[PDB]
Paper text:
The methyltransferase activity of MLL1 is regulated by three conserved core subunits, WDR5, RBBP5 and ASH2L. Among KMT2-associated regulators, RBBP5 and its yeast ortholog Swd1 play a pivotal role in the assembly and activity regulation of KMT2-family complexes. Both RBBP5 and Swd1 contain a WD40 propeller domain followed by a long C-terminal tail. The C-terminal tail can be further divided into two regions, a WD40 repeat proximal (WDRP) region and a C-terminal distal (CTD) region.
Selenomethionine-substituted crystals diffracted up to 1.8 Å resolution, and we were able to solve the complex structure by single-wavelength anomalous dispersion. The electron density map unambiguously allowed us to build the atomic model of the majority of RBBP5WD40 (residues 12–324) and two segments of RBBP5CTDM (residues 396–404 and 452–474). RBBP5CTDM exhibits an extended conformation and wraps the WD40 propeller through two segments, burying 1472 Å2 of the surface area at the interface. The first segment of RBBP5CTDM (CTD1) contains residues 396–404 and sits on the top surface of RBBP5WD40. Three leucine residues (L399, L400 and L402) in CTD1 fit snugly into the hydrophobic groove formed by residues from RBBP5WD40, including W35, L38, I50, W74, V95, L96, and the aliphatic side chain of K60. The second segment (CTD2) meanders its way around the side face of RBBP5WD40 and also pairs with the repeat 2 of the WD40 propeller to form a five-stranded β-sheet. The interface between RBBP5CTD2 and RBBP5WD40 consists of a set of hydrophobic residues, including I457, L459, V462, P469, L470 and L471 from RBBP5CTD2 and L28, C70, F106, I110, L111, P127, V133, V144 and L299 from RBBP5WD40. Combined mutation of CTD1 and CTD2 (L399A/L400A/I457A/L459A, named as RBBP5CTDM-4A mutant) further disrupted the RBBP5CTDM–RBBP52–333 interaction and reduced the HKMT activity of the MLL1 complex to the activity level comparable with that of the complete-CTD-deletion construct (RBBP52–381).
Residue numbers in the entry:
A (entry chain A): 12 to 324
B (entry chain C): 396 to 404, 452 to 474
Write the structure that this text describes.
Amino acid sequence: NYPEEADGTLDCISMALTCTFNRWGTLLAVGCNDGRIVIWDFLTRGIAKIISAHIHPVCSLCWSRDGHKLVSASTDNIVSQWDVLSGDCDQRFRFPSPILKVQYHPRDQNKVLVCPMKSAPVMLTLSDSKHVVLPVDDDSDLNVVASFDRRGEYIYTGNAKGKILVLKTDSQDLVASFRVTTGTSNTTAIKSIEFARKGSCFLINTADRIIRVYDGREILTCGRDGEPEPMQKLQDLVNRTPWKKCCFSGDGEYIVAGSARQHALYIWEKSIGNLVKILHGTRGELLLDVAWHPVRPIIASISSGVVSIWAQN
Amino acid sequence: SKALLYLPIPKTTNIELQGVPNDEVHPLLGVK
């Protein structure tokens, strides 16, 4: 199902900024603004390990497929791999601009996708510490966000002019592309691309405050410069809410989106597009992140330095 | 293979990217 009630907080002195569940949902890693990574035993809501990862705030985290490694990024352009069991730093990279996102290839944890600001995305290979700059469309200087699809067989990128590129992960061949445009046919920047843990659907969050949901299988069949039609367009027509972060439920049947203006989580049923629930946090606080548990109807959100948990309890 | 589920309680590489500006600010922290 989906959560429906506030169900406590994860109390830490470190100020939470971003969080992510491991594959099984047994651990929640929380990156904090003192540069620490706090790893919670999520089944008992107790702290399992604290890693002193960076000097400056942690802004992105991703667990490896086997659960043994975490990759982190700092707001002053560092990307590091951590061995979770030892807490040791395996290796460290320095980029020229701040890091918007890091993500392991979901089926090859030797590979890390990095999205620096005002740059093409970059693929790191950890075994030899080499990097490859991915291709871009339109202009070389736009902000570009990117995500592996569920199997990591493709990389989807989206730029500040609404251009979506679909690249084969191994060869970087451009297999499909399209441009998101508004009703006014102006361009709208891609803010994030998020994939479901099951199936083939993904969503795009854009600056026009509409969450567009597509089936990746349809995207591939439309090819280059296609005009695929979204399966759903999710938005608040009354408040014109911009979205900070969006996530699929673990079975891909629901979508949660956190408002960038109020402390509110909107939950839609994915196939029908109906709004099922809005969860309201403490008034006045700003949401920074949201994560849906991979197995259960439990959502974690971050505001005012605290992880809030929402459950059907 | 084998997986870490329960948690019972360095070499640096500089990546140089042509044309990427050096005065950007992370969106969490402000704007340039």
